[PDB]
Ligand binder design. Sequence first.
Ligand SMILES: Nc1nc2c(ncn2[C@@H]2O[C@H](COP(=O)(O)OP(=O)(O)OP(=O)(O)O)[C@@H](O)[C@H]2O)c(=O)[nH]1
Ligand SMILES: Nc1nc2c(ncn2[C@@H]2O[C@H](COP(=O)(O)OP(=O)(O)OP(O)(O)=S)[C@@H](O)[C@H]2O)c(=O)[nH]1
Ligand SMILES: Nc1nc2c(ncn2[C@@H]2O[C@H](COP(=O)(O)OP(=O)(O)OP(O)(O)=S)[C@@H](O)[C@H]2O)c(=O)[nH]1
Lengths: 426, 426, 422
Amino acid sequence: MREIVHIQAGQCGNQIGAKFWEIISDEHGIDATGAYHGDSDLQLERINVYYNEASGGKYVPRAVLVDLEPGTMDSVRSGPFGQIFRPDNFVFGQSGAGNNWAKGHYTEGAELVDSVLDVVRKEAESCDCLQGFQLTHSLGGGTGSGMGTLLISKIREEYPDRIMNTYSVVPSPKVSDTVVEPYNATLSVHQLVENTDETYCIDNEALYDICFRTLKLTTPTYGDLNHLVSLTMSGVTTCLRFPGQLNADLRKLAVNMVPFPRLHFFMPGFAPLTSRGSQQYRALTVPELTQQMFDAKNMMAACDPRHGRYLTVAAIFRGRMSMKEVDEQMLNIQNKNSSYFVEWIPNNVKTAVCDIPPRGLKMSATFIGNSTAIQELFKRISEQFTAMFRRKAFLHWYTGEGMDEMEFTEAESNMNDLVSEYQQYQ
Amino acid sequence: MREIVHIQAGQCGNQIGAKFWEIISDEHGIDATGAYHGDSDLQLERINVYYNEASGGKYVPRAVLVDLEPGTMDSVRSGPFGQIFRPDNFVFGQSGAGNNWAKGHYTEGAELVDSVLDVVRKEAESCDCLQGFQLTHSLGGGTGSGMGTLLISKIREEYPDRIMNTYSVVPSPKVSDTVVEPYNATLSVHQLVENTDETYCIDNEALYDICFRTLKLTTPTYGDLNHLVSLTMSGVTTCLRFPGQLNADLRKLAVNMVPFPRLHFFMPGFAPLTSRGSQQYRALTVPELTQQMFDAKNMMAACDPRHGRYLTVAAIFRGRMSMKEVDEQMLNIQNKNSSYFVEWIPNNVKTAVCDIPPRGLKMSATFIGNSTAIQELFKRISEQFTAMFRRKAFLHWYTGEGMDEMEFTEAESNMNDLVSEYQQYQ
Amino acid sequence: MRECISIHVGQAGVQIGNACWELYCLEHGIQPDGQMDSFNTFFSETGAGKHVPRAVFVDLEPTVVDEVRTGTYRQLFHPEQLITGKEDAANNYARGHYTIGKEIVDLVLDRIRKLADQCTGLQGFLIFHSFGGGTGSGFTSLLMERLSVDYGKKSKLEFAIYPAPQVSTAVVEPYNSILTTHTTLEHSDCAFMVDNEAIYDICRRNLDIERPTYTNLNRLIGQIVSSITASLRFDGALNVDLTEFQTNLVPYPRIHFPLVTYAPVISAEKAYHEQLSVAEITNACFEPANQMVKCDPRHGKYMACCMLYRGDVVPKDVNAAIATIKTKRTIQFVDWCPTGFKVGINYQPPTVVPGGDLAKVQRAVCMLSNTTAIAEAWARLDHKFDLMYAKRAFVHWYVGEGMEEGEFSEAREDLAALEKDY
Ligand SMILES: Nc1nc2c(ncn2[C@@H]2O[C@H](COP(=O)(O)OP(=O)(O)OP(=O)(O)O)[C@@H](O)[C@H]2O)c(=O)[nH]1
Ligand SMILES: Nc1nc2c(ncn2[C@@H]2O[C@H](COP(=O)(O)OP(=O)(O)OP(O)(O)=S)[C@@H](O)[C@H]2O)c(=O)[nH]1
Ligand SMILES: Nc1nc2c(ncn2[C@@H]2O[C@H](COP(=O)(O)OP(=O)(O)OP(O)(O)=S)[C@@H](O)[C@H]2O)c(=O)[nH]1
């Protein structure tokens, strides 16, 4: 029931999806091979949403692995929990777009679109009812963005009624890892305003600073980023996967977060996040989390909501507490953060609770909010695009793949209209 | 309930706050790590006023550590009871104002005000009801005074209804430890007449002489000063922390001590203070303390009240005795000290008793009094300021931080008006 | 059948109410939970072998309420009649009268109103508080006028802990005392004495307790209220109602401040040393030092005298002793009040506590009058107020609660007019 098919693009996307899958194996009591060992019926009652009916009392993730190179392929398969995936879900290229959107979308994507559509259709038909999709990729990378755009386009033209979310990784503003990454973000967003119902923006430097300061780690790594990503993962999907006094699903969140079809970018959230010698001393209560719900420190996608205005807030909780405390806390949050909040969307806090807490924590809290802070990020991206497109630098790589000038012109015009609409809302 | 947040500024302030915290760990039965081992329910019934709810049956002090240098930071954390504080409360600078008010208030305070406000707001919100604040710093030092002024200003603009007291350390008149310390005292007092509800003046040489003569020690140290400071500590806060037949709090004392908003400087007191071979021979009775309540020997802030006139007196007691003896003793104190007392404030003795005595002493007595003796200290400070400001010496350091002439002029005018009002009361 | 309501405000009020309920429970045999028809004047019949006090415990600070709800009598008291505050006025009348009192007066008004709803025989109201306490002054006063406006001519009795001339917990006590006295004067049907120093002196010299504690004071109030309410809670030869108490001692609304005294206060070892006869106990009680008031009544004139005998006391002996009291010249009365004597006889002996200072005795008398010596204390308080307000000290504290000095001044002149009305 309400089956969700996972598709992962790029090396970062593949690592994120894998880490998710081990986290789901923890949450649902699944070992490294696939056998179930959970101590409660709640883990295994709704295992079919992310697993399929496997013979011998086994379960395999409903995942699709896509890449243009088998290097991360082999590392993921040979890594932990690599035997839980059938070899068929691993489909890879042999060239690699080299961080180019046009190459991965047209040149090498031409011979991978058939495979990805075949596997996603097999996953959809082999299941009872596909509630929606979830994709992970990086907009900074060129190939991963191209696979994301191609898959969202094909899903929209194939399943226009089935909603989804895309967990794209926007490149960090502070670091220019790829010279042609502004093109990648440009084209990915131009396709996202058009083929995606809602999108969460995940920015690198914000999670980097969180791991550095909030978690108090001197050696941040991709592992902690994937861990927090998997926490966001579980926080969003626990309402559908696990029983709750206030049951919710991705459709509820999409209805509660999208006021306009083009206004669908939101910035996810997780809490509490404390270290060993603070957790045993911190208050394990709701106020310690509500002071952590709204802050630029434990903040996800690097643009401060204080400068802008929140559109609406969604809060999911997992633990043992009553509901009225949450309601009064949300009311106090409005009362004190009225200036930072929007005046014409009263009671803009979406409140739901999943009964089952995650493994190892008796609360986790996932802050799903939307603010006009992403306007700054989009405007900076647009001005950067104008800056190095005025010089017409690095255009040859794209024009060699069948590109054109005014195409990029309407792309930048689309982001201009999007940022203008967001400013008008502000 | 009635939670109090402690903020410590400067090396002396950090040492004082630490020593307080070990003394509170003694009084409330808390070990070096944080576990409770008190033999009575009275210690642990009101532990939440200075401690927070920590997991694993632990408790951590409600303290905030602020400095511009990590040297005393490391010594305090590596010293006794250093593990009872979470690493988050330790926030430090890296430059150091170098005993300069302007530097620590504007240059280096600009990048510390955000951190200190964030931590104090976290402490306020994570608690049930913040009754008030308590700050420790040294007016002789430049940075500590600047942090004191900045924090009192921010608290006044943020929590104008929540009262507090500041336990500032006025520089000793006899010794000029810092050449620019008159500027520090000037600016600190100019901000205290304006951002602080009440202040206790703690002078060095008076406690030095007490340790030398009254305690009969040939080697006075900072440890004994911090010990007597922690006794004052416990004496003021025991009425709120511990049950009493005459319950009291800091609000009661503030109401009983402040006749005018600008007239809020008081001079704390402690007794009895006797050595091993005098305690076993002295009378452990109230008269031995009432002869010790009013004396220039066991005297706190180096200005003799005999020259001036007492405004009003507050006396808190902790032990096993009846109340009428205290009342008649206070009446006799008036009867004999009428000349030293004020004629137009009848029955100016504030009488309250906390049932629970401090650990190791079956009485302690904390003499909270106000007299026009501080007029001499303030007038001497004002004339010193005039003396070395007429020469315009050492002004370059302050003017390089964004200072100005008539600003200091209205500062000295404010102390002139304050001393004139105190003389008018006299 | 009939009932009465007791009101407790502040630390002193809460402690006094707890002690009085301890008396009423041990006198009628109530175990700490509420089990084993005159006891219905203070307890309500619901269910099976159940009684709860008809009282409200309210204070701006939750310390005393927490202490009450931690005793073995948690089951005795309903939880909902205990009210916990958050911001103590800290000996500030204005703070507890405006800042915190105004937003918590509603629930208490509101539900004491139900306490009257199920008590159709409501004889009156009992109020216990302290002038020195800011809560016990401000909140008590405001609820007093609220009682007056929500009940009209209903009888109301006040028990106030007036700070002693040389005993004052707070130096700002004159402000609270004058303010509350001026505020509740017109509505205070009857307000008594409590002198803490006089209580200590009597306990140290009569009970010979060199080291007494506020428990002695608590039953000092407890025995006084028990002797007052024995007529309502037990039959007698001539029972006295609350209405007659204010009828006798308030011919003019201005003067309604009588002092109280008990007889005797004798320990068990000294109770072996003295058995009570009417003449000796009355003449001892009429002695100024035996009074728990630090004002010599012989300085002025006597308004009226009321006797509350309890136990096996002969009315003829009462009349003879009272007459021989009258003839002696140490006792003087006003010219226009020759016959101001009311005697209330009850057959219930005074009740003892285990481990208490008082000794278990079959008879007792309560000393009840309004002497002119109260004018001395009022004048001294007014003089202290004039001295300590002349330079306008601690006024800014009341200013921060939002009023200017005028009301202070006209309260001072109102109490001066009260003082010179004698
Ligand atoms: N006789 C008697 N008086 C008491 C007792 N306990 C407290 N008091 C009175 O209470 C006064 C002390 O102030 P409180 O009334 O307790 O003030 P509070 O309860 O803190 O209320 P706020 O001042 O508004 O904060 C003293 O002056 C006493 O007169 C008691 O046990 N016996
Ligand atoms: N949080 C997180 N970020 C990652 C991880 N791996 C890579 N990234 C980020 O992704 C960005 C690169 O995206 P990537 O997917 O590697 O591009 P690509 O186009 O797929 O690269 P290629 O296959 O053409 S060679 C880098 O900025 C890097 O910081 C990861 O494991 N966790
Ligand atoms: N009683 C007491 N006084 C102290 C203690 N430590 C320092 N002092 C006093 O404080 C004064 C110096 O204040 P201090 O806090 O050190 O200045 P500062 O501005 O913070 O110094 P810096 O950090 O810029 S280098 C000296 O006069 C010294 O006597 C102490 O532990 N106990």
